[PDB]
């Protein structure tokens, strides 16, 4: 049982009797006190002035703990000879010698204890537990160099074979080790003890008693090695079990109910840690990108405006037809980096050397396209800016801007969003300390560069460029085009769906080995859905297809999904644009992976056996080479 | 009872022993126990007829 032991205080007893129990303490049981333990290890002092007397609590050790700590003792008993040489822990610890057996009420709380009464419950005091674990840890600390050296000795030459059997004259092996052993190795200093430890760990190494002349297997771990070895016609049992476990854990990692729900799901429950994205504004279109604004090109009357920064130094700017801005509102907190490397921006009367390029933020009621006069800008601020520098380029008589990294952190909370009639705009442009003559500069902005966007809040989600409070995953299937996908924000719902489905793709891969156009346990649900759906009433010309053609179609569809997961969200995708097919696959994966019974494919079995034979042959050949040199006298 | 329903087909007794081709399953056993059981069931020693080698 688990929990602590309790003792009666009042005579009355019931499953809910008030105040009837009290914690049992070592004052009741003298055998638990540290003055009444057995110092077979030598931890408690023998001087009566060094052994304290303070009353101490009691806990209960569970059978799990007993088994695992005895396994911990076994972890030291392998290296007993070297511990003997170092004169450390002469008497091996025994855990059951620190447990006191008593019968009482056992439970975590008093109410649970009132209904529980066991006999031969084993209890310990915390200090005895700490002393035992400290002894084990000291023994482990003593054996670090020895363990590394023994692992080196085992790993120097092939000692294990995947299948079958090999053999070599042990004299040649010993000579090879003598020739390749490290100088500082404890294996040379203490040979016999290394030999005994190796005989314990492995069953191929065998030594004879020269007195009686007998040789036999002396490994102590036959039971586990039986499960590690591959029997005929089938891979090792533990490998199959572990691969199935890993696949099931991948499936559980991405919850299938969230990714195949037909009803709204909150944004935080759906979100995952995102990844950055890179864009170029000039190459982007206004129609596809829903977060861009442009002054209509028909203006042809640029105007110069002044704006102050946070410190109080004015700047000059020029706006004209075509000047592009990013519409900040309706987007989560975001991080922008502008990189102007590899660009010239060189004009007849404009030299990029020494010029300053910076971000500005405008806050105005008037929509951006209606902007003609200066006073319509409202409020503006130069958040950040950097000085430029040009170097000569590969092309003749050309120059390129060096590498720059300009940063901005859009945080809506630092702004006040109470007034709805308010527009927030972001610009990146040239700034000067004097007037910029419009005749001098003809570029609308500096937005023809690289722009890195990285999300700054993993709890909000956007669709097609606008924040949504809740998302319906089933309706995202088959509703995106590449033009609408590459121009999405970094925290889009499309990318979350792709990354949550990649785990399902890997899981399906692990347990399948089918080729092109072969039915599998995972490819049948789509076939069933197709077979049912083709018989349903619709509007077009109905088509009848047999069983084999449908099985081929389902196999191809599943393979296409595995190879490129994003196809489940692409418009006009062949089979994976029907949300019924996606839901069927997602639900059937769990059933397929739960009913496996320690099995593998036929192809995997045959390939594993063939490969094991090949490495067996290779190892035998290497040992023949080793025996040719370093010969046995 | 798990049994097919069908009546036996009568046959006359063969006057000499018949050939028998055995077929192996996937069961396995140790060789020593096989030798032991062969020792138990055998009818040796005996004196057979030799025949002509040429």
């Amino acid at each position: 049982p688990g929990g602590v032991p309790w003792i009666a205080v009042g005579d009355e007893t019931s499953v809910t009797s008030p105040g009837a129990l009290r914690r049992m303490t070592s004052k009741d049981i003298p055998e638990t006190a540290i003055i009444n333990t057995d110092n077979s290890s030598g931890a408690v002092p023998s001087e009566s002035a060094l052994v304290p007397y303070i009353d101490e609590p009691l806990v209960v050790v569970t059978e799990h703990a007993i088994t695992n700590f005895t396994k911990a003792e076994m972890a030291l008993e392998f290296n007993r000879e070297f511990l003997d040489k170092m004169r450390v822990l002469s008497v091996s610890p025994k855990y059951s010698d620190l447990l006191t057996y008593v019968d009482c009420y056992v439970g975590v709380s008093a109410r649970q204890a009132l209904n529980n009464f066991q006999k031969q419950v084993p209890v310990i005091t915390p200090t005895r537990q700490t002393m035992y674990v400290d002894s084990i840890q000291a023994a482990l600390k003593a054996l670090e160099k020895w363990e590394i050296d023994l692992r080196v000795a085992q790993t120097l030459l092939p000692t294990n074979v995947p299948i079958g059997e090999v053999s070599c004259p042990m004299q040649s092996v010993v000579k090879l080790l003598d020739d390749q052993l490290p100088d500082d190795s404890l294996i040379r200093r203490y040979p016999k003890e290394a030999a005994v430890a190796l005989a314990k760990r492995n069953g191929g190494i065998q030594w004879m008693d020269v007195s009686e002349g007998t040789v036999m297997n002396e490994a102590v771990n036959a039971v586990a090695a039986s499960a590690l070895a591959p029997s005929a016609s089938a891979p090792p049992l533990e490998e199959k079990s572990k691969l199935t476990e890993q696949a099931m854990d991948l499936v559980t990692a991405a919850e299938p109910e969230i990714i195949a729900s037909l009803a709204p799901v909150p944004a935080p429950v759906f979100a995952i840690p995102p990844k950055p994205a890179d864009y170029n504004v000039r190459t982007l279109r206004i129609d596809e990108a829903t977060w861009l604004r442009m002054i209509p090109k028909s203006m042809n009357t640029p105007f110069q405006i002044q704006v102050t920064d946070n410190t109080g130094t004015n700047w000059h700017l020029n706006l004209r037809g075509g000047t592009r801005v990013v519409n900040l509102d309706q987007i989560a907190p975001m991080r922008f980096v502008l990189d102007l490397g590899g660009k010239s921006y060189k004009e007849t009367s404009w030299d990029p050397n020494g010029k300053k390029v910076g971000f500005i933020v405008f806050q105005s009621k008037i929509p951006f396209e209606l902007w003609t006069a200066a006073s319509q800008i409202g409020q503006a601020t130069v958040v950040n800016y950097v000085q430029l520098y040009a170097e000569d380029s590969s092309f003749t008589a050309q120059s390129i801007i060096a590498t720059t990294s300009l940063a901005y952190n859009y945080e809506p909370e630092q702004l006040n969003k109470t007034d709805p009639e308010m527009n927030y705009y972001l610009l990146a442009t040239f700034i000067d300390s004097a007037a910029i003559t419009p005749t001098n500069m003809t570029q609308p902005d500096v937005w023809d560069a690289l722009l890195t966007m990285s999300p700054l809040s993993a709890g909000e989600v956007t669709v097609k460029g606008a924040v949504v409070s809740e998302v319906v995953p089933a309706d995202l299937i088959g509703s995106y085009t590449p033009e609408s996908l590459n121009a999405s924000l970094p925290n889009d719902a499309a990318r979350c769906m792709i990354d949550r489905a990649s785990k399902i793709a890997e899981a399906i891969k692990i347990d399948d080995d089918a080729g092109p156009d072969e039915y599998s346990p995972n490819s049948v649900p789509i076939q069933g859905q197709l077979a049912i759906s083709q018989l349903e009433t619709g509007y077009g010309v109905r088509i009848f297809n047999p069983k084999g053609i449908l099985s081929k179609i389902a196999s191809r569809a599943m393979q296409a999904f595995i190879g490129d997961p994003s196809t489940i969200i692409t418009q006009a995708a062949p089979v994976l644009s029907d949300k019924n097919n996606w839901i069927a696959l997602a639900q059937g994966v769990k059933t397929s992976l739960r009913t496996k019974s320690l099995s593998a494919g036929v192809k995997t079995a045959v390939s594993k056996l063939s490969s094991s034979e090949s490495i067996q042959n290779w190892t035998q050949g290497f040992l023949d080479k080793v025996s040719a040199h370093f010969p046995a006298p | 009872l798990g049994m097919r329903i069908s009546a036996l087909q009568s046959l006359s007794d063969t006057p000499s022993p018949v050939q028998w081709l055995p077929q192996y399953t996937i069961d396995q056993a140790a060789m020593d126990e096989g030798d032991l059981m062969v020792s138990r069931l055998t009818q040796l020693p005996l004196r057979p007829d030799y025949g002509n080698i040429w």
């Binding site: 688990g2 929990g3 569970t62 799990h64 703990a65 695992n68 396994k71 911990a72 076994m74 972890a75 392998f78 000795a153 092939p158 000692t159 294990n160 074979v161 995947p162 299948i163 079958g164 059997e165 090999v166 053999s167 070599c168 004259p169 004299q171 092996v173 010993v174 080790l177 003598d178 052993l181 294996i187 040379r188 203490y190 040979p191 016999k192 003890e193 030999a195 190796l198 760990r201 492995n202 069953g203 191929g204 190494i205 065998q206 030594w207 004879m208 008693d209 020269v210 007195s211 040789v215 297997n217 036959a222 586990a224 090695a225 039986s226 590690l228 070895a229 591959p230 094991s612 190892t619 | -």
Partner: protein, 42 residues
């Protein structure tokens, strides 16, 4: 295996009659890991 020294009172490392026969069934193992999860010990 031990090297550069021979002792024959009990086990002769460099002597005759020793076996070195690796196999898939015998393998080689130690105590790599255990079950020490907090919820199972209590």
């Amino acid at each position: 295996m031990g090297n550069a020294s021979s002792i024959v009172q009990t086990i002769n490392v460099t002597g005759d009659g020793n076996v070195f026969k690796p196999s898939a069934e015998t393998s080689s193992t130690a105590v790599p890991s255990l079950s020490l999860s907090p919820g199972m010990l209590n």
